Design an enzyme around this catalytic site. Structure first.
Site, PDB file in Angstrom:
ATOM      1  N   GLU A  18       6.440  76.568  31.328  1.00 54.58           N
ATOM      2  CA  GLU A  18       7.297  76.812  30.178  1.00 54.58           C
ATOM      3  C   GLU A  18       6.446  76.752  28.913  1.00 54.58           C
ATOM      4  OE1 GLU A  18      10.503  77.655  29.324  1.00 54.58           O
ATOM      5  OE2 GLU A  18       9.638  77.542  27.307  1.00 54.58           O
ATOM      6  N   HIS A  47      40.816  55.935  34.392  1.00 56.34           N
ATOM      7  CA  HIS A  47      39.707  55.080  34.826  1.00 56.34           C
ATOM      8  C   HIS A  47      39.895  54.807  36.309  1.00 56.34           C
ATOM      9  CE1 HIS A  47      36.665  51.833  34.409  1.00 56.34           C
ATOM     10  NE2 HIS A  47      37.436  51.130  35.219  1.00 56.34           N
TER      11      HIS A  47
HETATM   12  C1  LIG Z   1      42.824  49.115  45.962  1.00 55.35           C
HETATM   13  C2  LIG Z   1      43.195  49.417  44.529  1.00 55.35           C
HETATM   14  C3  LIG Z   1      42.812  50.625  43.944  1.00 55.35           C
HETATM   15  C4  LIG Z   1      43.156  50.903  42.618  1.00 55.35           C
HETATM   16  N1  LIG Z   1      42.789  52.068  42.039  1.00 55.35           N
HETATM   17  C5  LIG Z   1      43.011  52.270  40.717  1.00 55.35           C
HETATM   18  C6  LIG Z   1      42.506  53.394  40.082  1.00 55.35           C
HETATM   19  O1  LIG Z   1      41.850  54.225  40.743  1.00 55.35           O
HETATM   20  N2  LIG Z   1      42.731  53.589  38.767  1.00 55.35           N
HETATM   21  C7  LIG Z   1      43.443  52.677  38.065  1.00 55.35           C
HETATM   22  O2  LIG Z   1      43.651  52.856  36.846  1.00 55.35           O
HETATM   23  N3  LIG Z   1      43.942  51.572  38.667  1.00 55.35           N
HETATM   24  C8  LIG Z   1      43.737  51.347  39.985  1.00 55.35           C
HETATM   25  N4  LIG Z   1      44.211  50.246  40.599  1.00 55.35           N
HETATM   26  C9  LIG Z   1      44.985  49.264  39.848  1.00 55.35           C
HETATM   27  C10 LIG Z   1      44.080  48.482  38.900  1.00 55.35           C
HETATM   28  O3  LIG Z   1      43.181  47.665  39.659  1.00 55.35           O
HETATM   29  C11 LIG Z   1      44.966  47.607  38.048  1.00 55.35           C
HETATM   30  O4  LIG Z   1      45.884  48.441  37.335  1.00 55.35           O
HETATM   31  C12 LIG Z   1      44.160  46.799  37.051  1.00 55.35           C
HETATM   32  O5  LIG Z   1      43.290  45.915  37.761  1.00 55.35           O
HETATM   33  C13 LIG Z   1      45.112  45.990  36.182  1.00 55.35           C
HETATM   34  O6  LIG Z   1      44.341  45.164  35.326  1.00 55.35           O
HETATM   35  P1  LIG Z   1      44.968  43.835  34.690  1.00 55.35           P
HETATM   36  O7  LIG Z   1      43.926  43.250  33.771  1.00 55.35           O
HETATM   37  O8  LIG Z   1      46.365  44.134  34.200  1.00 55.35           O
HETATM   38  O9  LIG Z   1      45.202  42.892  35.963  1.00 55.35           O
HETATM   39  P2  LIG Z   1      44.082  42.380  36.993  1.00 55.35           P
HETATM   40  O10 LIG Z   1      42.979  43.403  37.095  1.00 55.35           O
HETATM   41  O11 LIG Z   1      44.805  41.955  38.251  1.00 55.35           O
HETATM   42  O12 LIG Z   1      43.521  41.048  36.313  1.00 55.35           O
HETATM   43  C14 LIG Z   1      44.298  39.855  36.301  1.00 55.35           C
HETATM   44  C15 LIG Z   1      43.308  38.698  36.353  1.00 55.35           C
HETATM   45  O13 LIG Z   1      43.905  37.452  35.972  1.00 55.35           O
HETATM   46  C16 LIG Z   1      43.573  36.439  36.941  1.00 55.35           C
HETATM   47  N5  LIG Z   1      44.704  35.478  36.980  1.00 55.35           N
HETATM   48  C17 LIG Z   1      45.944  35.698  37.456  1.00 55.35           C
HETATM   49  N6  LIG Z   1      46.687  34.581  37.265  1.00 55.35           N
HETATM   50  C18 LIG Z   1      45.907  33.665  36.647  1.00 55.35           C
HETATM   51  C19 LIG Z   1      46.116  32.363  36.207  1.00 55.35           C
HETATM   52  N7  LIG Z   1      47.321  31.770  36.370  1.00 55.35           N
HETATM   53  N8  LIG Z   1      45.107  31.690  35.612  1.00 55.35           N
HETATM   54  C20 LIG Z   1      43.910  32.274  35.443  1.00 55.35           C
HETATM   55  N9  LIG Z   1      43.678  33.528  35.861  1.00 55.35           N
HETATM   56  C21 LIG Z   1      44.661  34.242  36.463  1.00 55.35           C
HETATM   57  C22 LIG Z   1      43.318  37.194  38.236  1.00 55.35           C
HETATM   58  O14 LIG Z   1      42.394  36.474  39.055  1.00 55.35           O
HETATM   59  C23 LIG Z   1      42.737  38.516  37.758  1.00 55.35           C
HETATM   60  O15 LIG Z   1      41.305  38.441  37.653  1.00 55.35           O
HETATM   61  C24 LIG Z   1      43.876  49.976  41.875  1.00 55.35           C
HETATM   62  C25 LIG Z   1      44.256  48.770  42.465  1.00 55.35           C
HETATM   63  C26 LIG Z   1      43.916  48.492  43.789  1.00 55.35           C
HETATM   64  C27 LIG Z   1      44.335  47.186  44.422  1.00 55.35           C
END
Ligand SMILES: Cc1cc2nc3c(=O)[nH]c(=O)nc-3n(C[C@H](O)[C@H](O)[C@H](O)COP(=O)(O)OP(=O)(O)OC[C@H]3O[C@@H](n4cnc5c(N)ncnc54)[C@H](O)[C@@H]3O)c2cc1C
Ligand SMILES: Cc1cc2nc3c(=O)[nH]c(=O)nc-3n(C[C@H](O)[C@H](O)[C@H](O)COP(=O)(O)OP(=O)(O)OC[C@H]3O[C@@H](n4cnc5c(N)ncnc54)[C@H](O)[C@@H]3O)c2cc1C
Ligand SMILES: [Cl-]
Ligand SMILES: [Cl-]
Lengths: 471, 471
Positions: free
Chosen positions: B204, B444
Site C-alpha cells: 500500500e 443488553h
Molecule cells: C438465564 C438468564 C438469562 C437472561 N438473559 C437476559 C438477557 O439476555 N438480557 C436481559 O436484559 N436480561 C436477561 N436476563 C435477566 C437479567 O439477568 C435481569 O433482568 C437482571 O439481572 C436484573 O438486574 P437487577 O439488578 O434488577 O437484579 P439482579 O441482577 O438479580 O441483582 C439483584 C442483586 O441483589 C442481591 N440481593 C438480593 N437480595 C439481597 C439482600 N436482601 N441483601 C443483599 N443483597 C441482596 C442479589 O444477590 C443480586 O446480586 C436473564 C436472566 C437469566 C436468569
C-alpha cells in the site's frame, strides 16, 4: 453493632443496583452498596445474560462449522471437553466481575457484603462476614432482583431438576433433556445443550413459544426450531417423580405422550418472581404487592418518597437494560435533577438461532389498541447478504401508524437479528416516519438494510421486492 | 435492424440500473433495460459484493471454528474442496439472478441483451444476441458502471496476474499471494485466500490500509491483521515480471525487501475507473470528464436534461447503495416528482474480520472542515457481549459537534461492526444529539448497545466505564 451513616445505600449489586450506585458516586453522593454475594454484577453477570450468551456463541459456531460441510468445507465431529468450556465461561465472568470491582474501587464506593434488611424508614441492617452492620441513610435504592419460579409438586431438591443457574453450571450433557417453558431462557438453554449433543424436548402450556412475540416472526423461528427440538405446545406437566434411572414426567394436553417420559434432567424455566417480600420493607413503611413487586412511580420512588426501587423487583419486563436506565434515573433524582423514567420502548431479544428480537408495539398489541396501523415486512429470502451468509430464513418487520406514518413497532427473526433493534428503537424514540427510515441510505449488502427496505415497502418505493403499491 | 420506442431506456443492469428501471416501471413508465452480459445484477451481484461476501462468510466460519479449540471444542483441520465452494458461490449468484429476472418479468420490463451506444440525443443503438436494435427514447438513464484499474508495466495477460473477478473465480489457492492495494477489495480477497491457506503480502502506497478511514479505527484493525498478513505500507511496486516459476515483483520503500519477491499470483486491486468514455455519449451531446466520469446534478441529470446518469459512473463513492438510491431519485424525477439526491451521509463498510465501518464525517474530515468536535468511544474490552463472543478488540466511536451536541459521524471496528451503522446513519440523518441516543434504551447484552454507551460517554453519565466527566 458497627454503625455507618451514608447519603445513599443501594441494596443489590446487579445491573440496576451497581449502575445506580456508580451514577450516585459520579454525581457526588456518598454511596454504599450492600450485596449478599461476593462479586458484583448480580444475576445478569454471574448466572444470567453473560454466561448464557457465551455458551450460545459456542453453540452457534458449532452449528455453523457443521453447516459448512455441504459447501465444501468438512470439519470432523468436534472433540469436546465440557470442563474447558466451563472454565472459559468462568473466565469471561471473572474478567467482568474484576472490572466491576475495579470501577467500584475507582469511584470510592464502599461494598458491604451480607444480607440487608430494613429496620426503619432510614435504617438498613446487614448481616454478613463482618457481623451486623447498621446503615443509617438519607436515601435507599432497592435493587434486590428476582429468582426462578419453583413448583410445589416438583422435587427441586433432586440434582437432576435444574433451574437456569444449574443449567449454566454445565455439570454434564444429559442424553435426554426436558425444558419446561417455551420462554426465552428455556429456548436458549435448549439451544446450548442441543449443540452439545443433548436431545431436547420442550413442554409449553401456551399455543406458541415466546408468547409475547408476533405470530409471523415466531412462525419462522418455530419452523427452524422444530427440526431440532420436540415441541409440545398446549401441554402441561402434572407430575414429576425422581427415580434412580431418571426423572419421570407426566404430561397432559394436546401433544402429551400416553406414558410418563424418562429424562436425564429437567430444566424448570417457567419464569421468575421478584424478591420484594424478603427485605422487611414494611419496617421502612414500603408497600410490597401480593406478587412480591415493589411498585414505583416515574421517578422510581416507592410510596415512601426517600426510598426508591429499580430493576426486576419493580415490575416487568425483567431485563438488564431496563434496570440500568432506571438506576441512572433514580440516582439523578436523588441528586436533585428533575428526571423521569418514561421510555417509549423497551427492546426484547431471544438469543436463539435464529434470534428473535422486537421493540415497541407488536401487531397483537396494535390490533387490541384499535389504531389504524399497517405492517411492512422484508423476507430474508430476498436478501443478498442473508443468502450469501447462508441464513435466508429470516424476516424484518416494521409496524407503522397508518395515518401519521410514524414507526410504532418493529421485529426481526434471523441470524444477528437482535443487532438490528438499535436503529428501530432509535427510530421510534425520535418519532420517525417511514420516509425518514427509507430515505436514509443503508449499507449494502447487510442484514440491517432490511430495516430500510421494510420502510420502502410501506412507502411503495421498494424495488428489491415486487411492489403491490405500484401502478 | 429492429426498432423500438419506449419512454425510458436504462443502459446497464447493475444495482443502480435495475433499481432505476424497476422504479420507472412502478411509476407507470414504459421501460427497457439494456445489458451487454447475459445476467442481471451487474458487478455487485456477479463479480463483486455478493460473491465476496459469500466467500468472506466462509472464511469467518473457518476462523471461528479454529478459535473454539482454546475453549474446549476441537475441530480437526478442515478438508476443503475448492470446486464445491465455487459451486456454492455460483449457486447464491444464480438464486439471486433468478429473483431479479422474476422481478423484471413481473414489472413487464423488457431486457435487451447487447452493447449499447448513443447515436443521437434520443436514439440508443444496441448490438446484441438478437442482432442490432434501435431504441428511440424520451428519457435515458446511463448506469454503465466501472471497471478495475490496469497498469501499463504489469503483464496483465498472464493468468497469474489477477483482478477481483479472477480472485472470485477461485481457480486455485496460491501458496503465496501478493495483494497490490490496501483498499477494501484487496483486504477482503486477502482475507478469503488467507483463510483458504494462502500466504498474504499486502502493498500500500499510503501510511495506512483503508486510507479513507480514521487512523485509530484502522489501527485496531491493523493490529489484528498484521499477524496474518505481511503489510508493506508506504511501499510502491516498481516492477512486475512473469517467469516460469512465478511472478517476480520489485518494490521500494521502508519494509520492501531489497530483492524481487516471487509470488504464485498477484492481485491488482488498486482501484476502479468509470466507463463513461465508452458509450459514444458525445453523440447525444452528453459531457464526459477527462477521466470518464459523467458528472450529474442533484436530480441525477447530465448536461443534457432528458438524459440522466447514476451509480459508479457518476462519481465516488463507488458503492451499490448509492447507486440504488440515485436510481430511485432519477426514476422519480422522470415521472415528474420534484425529488433530489442529497443524503447527509453515505455509509462505507470493509467486510474484513474484524469489520471496519463508518458513516458521516471522520475526524480527518471534521478537522479539514474546521469543525469544533468531540469524540466519544466505547472500547469493546468493556463489552460483556464482545467478551462472551470472543471479539473484545473492537471499538465504537461517535463524533459530535461540540457546541450543538449533534452526532455528525460514527465508526465501528469489530465483529459484526457493519450491522451497527444503520442506527448511526439514521441518527445523523435525523439530527439527533448525544442525549437522544443515550436515553434510547439499547438491549443488553449486545454489540450495538455500544452506540448508546458511546453517547453516554459524551453525556457524562456512563457507568459501564470510569467516567472522567464525573463530579
Ligand atoms: C438465564 C438468564 C438469562 C437472561 N438473559 C437476559 C438477557 O439476555 N438480557 C436481559 O436484559 N436480561 C436477561 N436476563 C435477566 C437479567 O439477568 C435481569 O433482568 C437482571 O439481572 C436484573 O438486574 P437487577 O439488578 O434488577 O437484579 P439482579 O441482577 O438479580 O441483582 C439483584 C442483586 O441483589 C442481591 N440481593 C438480593 N437480595 C439481597 C439482600 N436482601 N441483601 C443483599 N443483597 C441482596 C442479589 O444477590 C443480586 O446480586 C436473564 C436472566 C437469566 C436468569
Ligand atoms: C470485488 C468487489 C466488491 C465490492 N464490494 C462492495 C460492497 O461490499 N458494498 C458495496 O456497496 N459495493 C461494493 N462493490 C462495488 C459495487 O459492486 C458497485 O458499486 C456497483 O456494482 C455499482 O453498480 P452500477 O449499477 O453503478 O454499476 P455496475 O454494477 O457495474 O453495472 C453496470 C452494468 O452495465 C453493463 N454495461 C457497461 N457498459 C455497457 C454498455 N455499453 N452497454 C450495455 N451494458 C453495459 C455492465 O456489463 C454492468 O452489468 C464491490 C465491487 C467489487 C468489484
Ligand atoms: Cl405446569
Ligand atoms: Cl427408585
Amino acid at each position: 453493632s458497627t454503625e455507618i451513616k451514608t447519603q445513599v445505600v443501594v441494596l443489590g449489586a446487579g445491573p440496576a443496583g451497581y449502575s445506580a450506585a456508580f451514577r450516585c458516586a459520579d454525581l457526588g453522593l456518598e454511596t454504599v452498596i450492600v450485596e449478599r454475594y461476593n462479586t458484583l454484577g448480580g444475576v445478569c453477570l454471574n448466572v444470567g445474560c453473560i454466561p448464557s450468551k457465551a455458551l450460545l456463541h459456542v453453540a452457534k459456531v458449532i452449528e455453523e462449522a457443521k453447516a459448512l460441510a455441504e459447501h465444501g468445507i468438512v470439519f470432523g465431529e468436534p472433540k469436546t471437553d465440557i470442563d474447558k468450556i466451563r472454565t472459559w465461561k468462568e473466565k469471561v465472568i471473572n474478567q467482568l466481575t474484576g472490572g466491576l470491582a475495579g470501577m467500584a474501587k475507582g469511584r470510592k464506593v464502599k461494598v458491604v457484603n451480607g444480607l440487608g434488611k430494613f429496620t426503619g424508614a432510614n435504617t438498613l441492617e446487614v448481616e454478613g462476614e463482618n457481623g451486623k452492620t447498621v446503615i443509617n441513610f438519607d436515601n435507599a435504592i432497592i435493587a434486590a432482583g428476582s429468582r426462578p419460579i419453583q413448583l410445589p409438586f416438583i422435587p427441586h431438591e433432586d440434582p437432576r431438576i435444574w433451574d437456569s443457574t444449574d443449567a449454566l453450571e454445565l455439570k454434564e450433557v444429559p442424553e435426554r433433556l426436558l425444558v419446561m417453558g417455551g420462554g426465552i431462557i428455556g429456548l436458549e438453554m435448549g439451544t446450548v445443550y442441543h449443540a452439545l449433543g443433548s436431545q431436547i424436548d420442550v413442554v409449553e402450556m401456551f399455543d406458541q413459544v415466546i408468547p409475547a412475540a408476533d405470530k409471523d416472526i415466531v412462525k419462522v423461528f418455530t419452523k427452524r426450531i422444530s427440526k431440532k427440538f420436540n415441541l409440545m405446545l398446549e401441554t402441561k406437566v402434572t407430575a414429576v417423580e425422581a427415580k434412580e434411572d431418571g426423572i419421570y414426567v407426566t404430561m397432559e394436553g394436546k401433544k402429551a405422550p400416553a406414558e410418563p417420559q424418562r429424562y436425564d434432567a429437567v430444566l424448570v424455566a417457567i419464569g421468575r418472581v421478584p424478591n420484594g417480600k424478603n427485605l422487611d420493607a414494611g419496617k421502612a413503611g414500603v408497600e410490597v404487592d401480593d406478587r412480591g413487586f415493589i411498585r414505583v412511580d416515574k421517578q422510581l420512588r416507592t410510596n415512601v418518597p426517600h426510598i426508591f426501587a429499580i430493576g426486576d423487583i419493580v415490575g416487568q419486563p425483567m431485563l438488564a437494560h431496563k434496570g440500568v436506565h432506571e438506576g441512572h434515573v433514580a440516582a439523578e433524582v436523588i441528586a436533585g435533577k428533575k428526571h423521569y423514567f418514561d421510555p417509549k420502548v423497551i427492546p426484547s431479544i431471544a438469543y436463539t438461532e435464529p434470534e428473535v428480537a422486537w421493540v415497541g408495539l407488536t401487531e397483537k398489541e396494535a390490533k387490541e389498541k384499535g389504531i389504524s396501523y399497517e405492517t411492512a415486512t422484508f423476507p430474508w429470502a430476498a436478501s443478498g447478504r442473508a443468502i450469501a451468509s447462508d441464513c435466508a430464513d429470516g424476516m424484518t418487520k416494521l409496524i407503522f401508524d397508518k395515518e401519521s406514518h410514524r414507526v410504532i413497532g418493529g421485529a426481526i427473526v434471523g441470524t444477528n437479528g437482535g443487532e438490528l433493534l438499535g436503529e428501530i428503537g432509535l427510530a421510534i424514540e425520535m418519532g420517525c416516519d417511514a420516509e425518514d427510515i427509507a430515505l436514509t441510505i443503508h449499507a449494502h449488502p447487510t442484514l440491517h438494510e432490511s430495516v430500510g427496505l421494510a420502510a420502502e415497502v410501506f412507502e411503495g418505493s421498494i424495488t428489491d421486492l415486487p411492489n403491490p403499491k405500484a401502478k
